């Protein structure tokens, strides 16, 4: 038996651990394998470098430094380490297994130190050869230059970076005062610097002059800009002899480079098999001490004291698994476990499954719920996709979105296992919430009677047209009945359709908003009762209810009442709802057109009821506390709450008009797109007509999918999120809770770790 912790948080228990120092390390590995308990910090007051296990932490920390260094050496080359073996110790199931012995950890420390000493000397000895190889290659390029290069000691020459040459030419023209004779050529292969392991586009240059005292300055200036100067003879024979000698040195040097370099890579290819396994062991060895570092060490007894939160529901398993540990370890011990009660705030924990998880994330992304207050997750499951659908209403776009999610959810066994891109992982995490908002989009699209901006003539219409008319003659329909499901299709293409649709959708928007807020607000009552806080009932809930329903509940009743009265048959003018709402405040007790008997009496009463609730809401709770200068904070909080609540009441109710606005925009884009990219095709005939039709459909489908699903769907979807976080959730959600974060083991990516 386990409790269904989705309507409220799981019940949490605080438990103390007394562990003998002998079994300490072994036991803490089991608690990590449990992956179930969240520890407290018992001695936050002592400074970081004064905590008792600091030396142990330093020891493994130095090993991790060396493992980052080794991983750098691998990544510097094309070498790649052995992937996988993620599950060797744990399937994530929490099965007990034995940790490395202390001598194994010592060996890792000793081994890691030994490898750094070797690779440091080996690497440094290597790049010294590479520099000489690079230097001679540059020198040879000069000798291989044509005699043309040397025509116009008589000169200075060398190699320089291609960006700097512009400054060198400018400086030399400056100091030679216009007597400059200067030549340069490009080099085709970029050259790397060991100084940076970044490559340069190099360039070669030569300048001519006779004066010794000028030549000295030229050499200093060129060297100043990091140029490699080279001595080169003026005779073609001398250059050939120098070229021959350089080629010998360069030829011999490859033998040195290959022998040493292949030795190094053979070393790396060995450690590349084991490094990831070493890293997984050592990181856990650090983490376990990091937990022990938060416990209370006792000097009068060989015992450590620790505390942590465990779900009350799970506690029996904790006792069982420690029994298994003692069974394998053999060492006898008194009861490690003692359960404890306190006034500390427990963490918040909600159990979840592959369905609810996506919806729960959308709530936790706003804040962590207070311990055992109403979880916003459950109301979000249906109201989030439905409040999306009521905007994104179209059977066509609803189907395309449903089909997309189906392709994604049916493959979930396969998709879950492979690596996923940044955006694709967000989509896969949302597969169920996309599916659910897809199927709702179909239903409300059907009630709007719209599929790809065309209506569906399922049932017989309730409107009848005249019995005769002429080509292009204007006509008006007469009513016969009421359509059974959704909007009557007689309205399509109707030149006054907008005046009906906007009347209908705006009233639908307000009604949905009022009901959603009313339903959400009643969760506030469910919290006050559960925590047995009556002053919150009498001070906050009741006055808020009367103020909210007294105005906007009345407005909702009016608009739904007005639909029930046949104003045309009964011979009374249809009253204006905007007028009566405004006049109820700006001219109370006066009416333009009567909606029902005794209207004036009720309106003034409801106005007075709304007004008296203001001081009632403002005062009663502070006064109650005053009768039991901290009371000042209660006073300030209540007035801030009062003024916010009252103006939010109108502001939030108004904001629900967005449901109508997004729908009307979505409808018009759909209609225009068809009118611009499909209706054209029917004007053509023959094989040109076929080609025009085939081309235009592809354009229509591309725009339909790219804009009217991906972009419009995204826009409507995140407006649904807004209405939940702000308008709906603020009525009951307290938040600022503490998240449940148990100590546990998992695989650590070597790439992310070095990053």
């Amino acid at each position: 038996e386990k409790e269904e912790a989705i309507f409220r948080s799981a019940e949490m228990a605080l438990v103390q651990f007394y562990i003998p120092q002998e079994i300490s390390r072994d036991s803490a590995y089991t608690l990590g394998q449990l992956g179930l308990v969240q520890f407290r910090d018992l001695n936050s007051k002592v400074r970081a470098f004064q905590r008792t296990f600091v030396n142990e932490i330093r020891r493994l920390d130095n090993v991790e430094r060396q493992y980052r260094y080794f991983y750098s050496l691998l990544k510097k080359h094309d070498i790649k380490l052995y992937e996988g073996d993620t599950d060797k110790y744990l399937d994530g199931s929490g099965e007990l297994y034995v940790p490395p012995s202390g001598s194994v950890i010592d060996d890792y420390v000793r081994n890691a130190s030994y490898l750094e000493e070797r690779l440091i000397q080996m690497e440094d000895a290597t790049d010294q050869i590479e520099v000489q190889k690079n230097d001679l290659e540059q020198y040879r390029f000069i000798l291989q230059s044509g005699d043309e290069f040397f025509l116009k000691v008589n000169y200075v020459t060398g190699v320089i970076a291609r960006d700097k040459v512009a400054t060198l030419e400018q400086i030399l023209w400056r100091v030679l005062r216009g007597n400059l004779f200067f030549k340069t050529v490009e080099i085709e292969q970029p050259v790397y610097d060991v100084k940076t392991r970044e490559y340069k586009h190099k360039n070669a240059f030569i300048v001519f002059s006779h004066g010794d005292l000028i030549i000295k300055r030229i050499r200093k200036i060129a060297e100043s800009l990091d140029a490699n100067l080279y001595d080169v003879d003026s005779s073609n024979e001398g250059r050939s002899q120098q070229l021959a000698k350089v080629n010998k040195n360069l030829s011999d040097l490859y033998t040195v480079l290959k022998t040493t370099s292949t030795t190094l890579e053979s070393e790396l290819y060995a450690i590349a098999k084991e490094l990831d396994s070493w890293f997984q062991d050592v990181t856990r060895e650090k983490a376990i001490f990091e937990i022990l570092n938060k416990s209370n060490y006792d000097t009068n007894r060989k015992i450590l004291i620790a505390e942590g939160w465990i779900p009350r529901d799970e506690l029996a398993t904790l006792q069982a698994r420690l029994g298994e540990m003692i069974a394998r370890l053999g060492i006898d011990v008194p009861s490690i476990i003692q359960v404890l009660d306190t006034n500390h705030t427990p963490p918040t924990f909600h159990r979840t499954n592959k369905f609810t998880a996506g919806f729960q994330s959308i709530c936790d992304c706003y804040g962590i719920a207070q311990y055992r207050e109403i979880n916003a997750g459950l109301p979000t499951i249906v109201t989030f996709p439905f409040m999306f659908a009521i905007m994104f209403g179209d059977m066509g776009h609803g189907f395309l979105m449903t089909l997309a999610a189906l392709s994604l959810v049916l493959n979930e066994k396969k998709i879950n296992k492979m690596k996923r891109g940044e955006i694709f992982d967000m989509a896969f995490t949302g597969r169920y919430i996309i599916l659910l908002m897809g199927v709702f989009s179909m239903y409300t699209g059907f009630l709007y009677n719209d599929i790809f901006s065309k209506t569906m003539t399922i049932f017989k219409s309730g409107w009848k047209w005249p019995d005769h008319w002429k080509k292009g003659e204007s006509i008006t329909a007469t009513s016969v009945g009421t359509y059974p499901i959704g909007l009557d299709w007689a309205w399509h293409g109707t030149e006054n359709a907008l005046l009906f649709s906007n009347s209908y959708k705006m009233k639908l928007s307000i009604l949905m908003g009022f009901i959603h807020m009313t339903y959400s607000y009643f969760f506030s009552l469910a919290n006050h009762l559960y925590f047995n806080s009556m002053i919150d009932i009498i001070g906050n809930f009741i006055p808020g209810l009367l103020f909210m329903q007294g105005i906007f509940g009345y407005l909702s009743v009016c608009i739904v009442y007005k639909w029930a009265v046949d104003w045309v048959k009964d011979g009374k003018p249809a009253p204006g709802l905007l007028n009566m709402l405004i006049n109820m405040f700006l001219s109370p007790g006066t009416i333009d057109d009567e909606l029902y008997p005794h209207q004036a009496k009720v309106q003034v009463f409801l106005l007075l009821m709304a007004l008296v609730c203001i001081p009632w809401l403002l005062l009663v709770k502070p006064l109650h506390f005053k009768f039991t200068e901290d009371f000042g904070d209660i006073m300030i909080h209540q007035v801030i709450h009062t003024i916010e609540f009252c103006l939010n009441c109108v502001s939030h109710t108004a904001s629900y008009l967005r449901l109508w606005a997004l729908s009307l925009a979505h409808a018009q884009l759909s209609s225009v797109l068809w009118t611009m990219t499909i209706q054209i095709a029917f004007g053509f005939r023959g094989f040109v007509g076929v080609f025009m039709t085939v081309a235009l459909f592809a354009m229509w489908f591309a725009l339909t999918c790219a804009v009217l699903v991906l972009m419009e769907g995204t826009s409507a979807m995140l407006h649904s999120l807004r209405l939940h976080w702000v308008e709906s959730m603020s009525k009951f959600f307290v938040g600022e809770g503490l998240p449940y974060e148990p100590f546990a083991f998992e695989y650590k990516d070597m790439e992310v770790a070095v990053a």
Binding site: W469, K470, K471, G472, S474
Partner: protein, 115 residues
């Protein structure tokens, strides 16, 4: 392009009652003025009746109290009804629709009536 059509014409028994119907299409606005005219053989066109967009009516003296002109429910539709007919009423009848200013003055093709 705007166009108009009469209907309801034909022969009728002496003293019988009759109705003529007319419509105009292809313009977005309501016509300020719409009217009926008639023409017997051997004569110029003769005025019969006219009605404003505000429903004001005017008639020729010869048909005063015999003919009635009215507009329909929908924009730019027109009716004429005569409660009794005589040989001096026989002619082809035309619709006319006008604008308060400018050359926009439209005329129909016409329809015949005889006793």
């Amino acid at each position: 392009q705007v166009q108009l059509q009469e209907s309801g014409g034909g022969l009728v028994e002496i003293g019988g009652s009759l109705r003529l119907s007319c419509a105009a299409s292809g313009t977005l606005f309501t016509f300020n003025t719409m009217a009926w005219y008639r023409q017997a053989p051997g004569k110029q066109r003769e005025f019969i009746a006219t009605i404003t967009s505000g429903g004001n009516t005017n008639y020729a003296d010869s048909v005063q109290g015999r003919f009635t002109i009215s507009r329909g429910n929908a924009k730019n539709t027109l009716y004429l009804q005569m409660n009794s007919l005589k040989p001096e009423d026989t002619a082809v009848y035309y619709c006319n629709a006008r604008t308060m200013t400018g050359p926009f003055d439209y005329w129909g093709q016409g329809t015949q009536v005889t006793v």
